[PDB]
Amino acid sequence: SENITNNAKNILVQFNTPVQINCTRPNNNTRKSIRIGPGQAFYATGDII
Amino acid sequence: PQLQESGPTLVEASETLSLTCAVSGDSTAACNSFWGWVRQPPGKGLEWVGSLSHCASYW
Amino acid sequence: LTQPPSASGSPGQSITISCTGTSNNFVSWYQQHAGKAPKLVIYDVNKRPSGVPDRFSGSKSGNTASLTVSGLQTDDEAVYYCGSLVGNWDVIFGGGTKLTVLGQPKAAPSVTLFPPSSEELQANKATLVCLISDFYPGAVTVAWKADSSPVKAGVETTTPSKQSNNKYAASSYLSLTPEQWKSHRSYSCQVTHEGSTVEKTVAP
Ligand SMILES: *[C@@H]1O[C@H](CO)[C@@H](O[C@@H]2O[C@H](CO)[C@@H](O[C@@H]3O[C@H](CO[C@H]4O[C@H](CO[C@H]5O[C@H](CO)[C@@H](O)[C@H](O)[C@@H]5O)[C@@H](O)[C@H](O[C@H]5O[C@H](CO)[C@@H](O)[C@H](O)[C@@H]5O)[C@@H]4O)[C@@H](O)[C@H](O[C@H]4O[C@H](CO)[C@@H](O)[C@H](O)[C@@H]4O[C@H]4O[C@H](CO)[C@@H](O)[C@H](O)[C@@H]4O[C@H]4O[C@H](CO)[C@@H](O)[C@H](O)[C@@H]4O)[C@@H]3O)[C@H](O)[C@H]2NC(C)=O)[C@H](O)[C@H]1NC(C)=O
Ligand SMILES: *[C@@H]1O[C@H](CO)[C@@H](O[C@@H]2O[C@H](CO)[C@@H](O[C@@H]3O[C@H](CO[C@H]4O[C@H](CO[C@H]5O[C@H](CO)[C@@H](O)[C@H](O)[C@@H]5O)[C@@H](O)[C@H](O[C@H]5O[C@H](CO)[C@@H](O)[C@H](O)[C@@H]5O)[C@@H]4O)[C@@H](O)[C@H](O[C@H]4O[C@H](CO)[C@@H](O)[C@H](O)[C@@H]4O[C@H]4O[C@H](CO)[C@@H](O)[C@H](O)[C@@H]4O[C@H]4O[C@H](CO)[C@@H](O)[C@H](O)[C@@H]4O)[C@@H]3O)[C@H](O)[C@H]2NC(C)=O)[C@H](O)[C@H]1NC(C)=O
Ligand SMILES: *[C@@H]1O[C@H](CO)[C@@H](O[C@@H]2O[C@H](CO)[C@@H](O)[C@H](O)[C@H]2NC(C)=O)[C@H](O)[C@H]1NC(C)=O
Questions:
Q1: Ligand 2: residue whose CA is nearest its atom 49
Q2: Of C92, C95, C157, the CB nearest to B48
Q3: Are B21 and B30 a contacting pair, CB within 8 Å?
Q4: Cβ partners under 8 Å of residue B39, min gap 6
Q5: C28, C29, C36, C93: which to substitute to probe chain B, counting the most B Cβ within 10 Å?
Q6: Which residues are glycosylated (chain A) (predicted)?
Q7: What is the SS3 assignment for B34?
Q8: Which domains does chain C have, with CATH numbers?
């Protein structure tokens, strides 16, 4: 901590053993890839399967 | 959409029965439906065999 | 799933066939013409598919699911199966209900029972055949008995078929050993048609 007794300063912590974390996107998606030309293509979010 | 079954109509006992369906007008890749078989013994009721789909999840 | 064995109606009348054992809403009914492939007439209970008349409607009350056909016609004569999802991903089918829209008139079945022959016993084989005919509707269950107690083994029963007089007919084949044939005197064959049963018995 920059200033410990000071509650206005954040306290940075460093771990010994790494912690396993899993973050997933339980939505199987599709890309529309709509055409907003000329030459440009936007990727829209389709339906979730 | 048409389903055409094909394979041996006559098989000997204790052997391996193999049958193959040929789809027309639709894709097996499509995630809207499952694909499988349903067998109906002669003069009897409908029995479910099984179905599968490659459209998976994260695990 | 338990589906009633038979169902009958005149043209224009409305028939309601039931199904039980469905705790979920995944219930679906099918129509199979004899000598053809089954076709789905309803899904997700009441909802109808493409090219299916309004007169087919699904319904589920409690544990009982029901199909209702109003304004009967010739093309409605077939076997109707029900099915639903169960447990995790398994699916089952009922025995199916045979609904007939045949021409008039209703009539009690007719049973003729033939004991094994003398030449047949020489092959060390014994077979009794129940001949049931001239009944409406076209769905009948057959049962076998020996003296008193019923016979659960060697029973082969086949789906009935229409005749030239438009009356349905079926035959059940019982194949057993000659030892149990001579030991048990009489063999009874019970034929159940719309609640009422018709019985025949033979002894050597
Ligand atoms: C990192 O973070 C940490 C914490 O997270 C930060 O730490 C903070 O640091 C600041 C400093 O900037 C501290 O504030 C100063 O506190 C001191 C000390 O105060 C304590 O002690 C006093 C005396 O204690 C002794 O006497 C008693 C009696 O006998 C005895 O019982 C005791 O045991 C001990 O022996 C107490 O008076 C004082 O209490 C008062 O203050 C409390 C805090 O506000 C309050 O709660 C109490 O109720 C009571 O009111 C406390 O216990 C103070 O002395 C100092 O005051 C100076 O600064 C303020 C501005 O904040 C200013 O207004 C004052 O006038 C004073 O300035 C005088 O001193 C200067 C230096 O000598 C001088 O240059 C000035 O000119 C001025 O002197 C003038 O006046 C006097 C008479 O008044 C005269 O004689 C002179 O000649 C001249 O004319 C501050 O308040 C914080 O306390 C501390 N935090 C905590 C939690 O403690 C740190 O800053 C951070 N750093 C970084 C880099 O991030
Ligand atoms: C999330 O949802 C999505 C859907 O939105 C799911 O994605 C589906 O996943 C399944 C499963 O992987 C895929 O099936 C695979 O297909 C490939 C071929 O893919 C190409 O062709 C497809 C069909 O195209 C035809 O039909 C369409 C539609 O009618 C038509 O338009 C087209 O013109 C053509 O006529 C295309 O759909 C497909 O496009 C996809 O990919 C594009 C990028 O490439 C993308 O842009 C598209 O949008 C679309 O997503 C593509 O063009 C098969 O090759 C593959 O088979 C192998 O892989 C599976 C596992 O994936 C495995 O089980 C099989 O056994 C097989 O593995 C063997 O063969 C490999 C070579 O073929 C070999 O490398 C392997 O090692 C293995 O070989 C070993 O084992 C075998 C025995 O198994 C042995 O014989 C060998 O000797 C050797 O030992 C799949 O079947 C779908 O295509 C895909 N998409 C869709 C839309 O369904 C996804 O699964 C869901 N879940 C997750 C987590 O994402
Ligand atoms: C999000 O809403 C759109 C309509 O704005 C849906 O797209 C329609 O889907 C139905 C299927 O029930 C089709 O009959 C229509 O032709 C579609 N209309 C258009 C303009 O695409 C879409 O299905 C909804 N989200 C999804 C894909 O579930």
A1: B29
A2: C92
A3: no
A4: B47, B49
A5: C93
A6: 3, 16, 22, 28
A7: coil
A8: 1-103 (2.60.40.10), 104-204 (2.60.40.10)
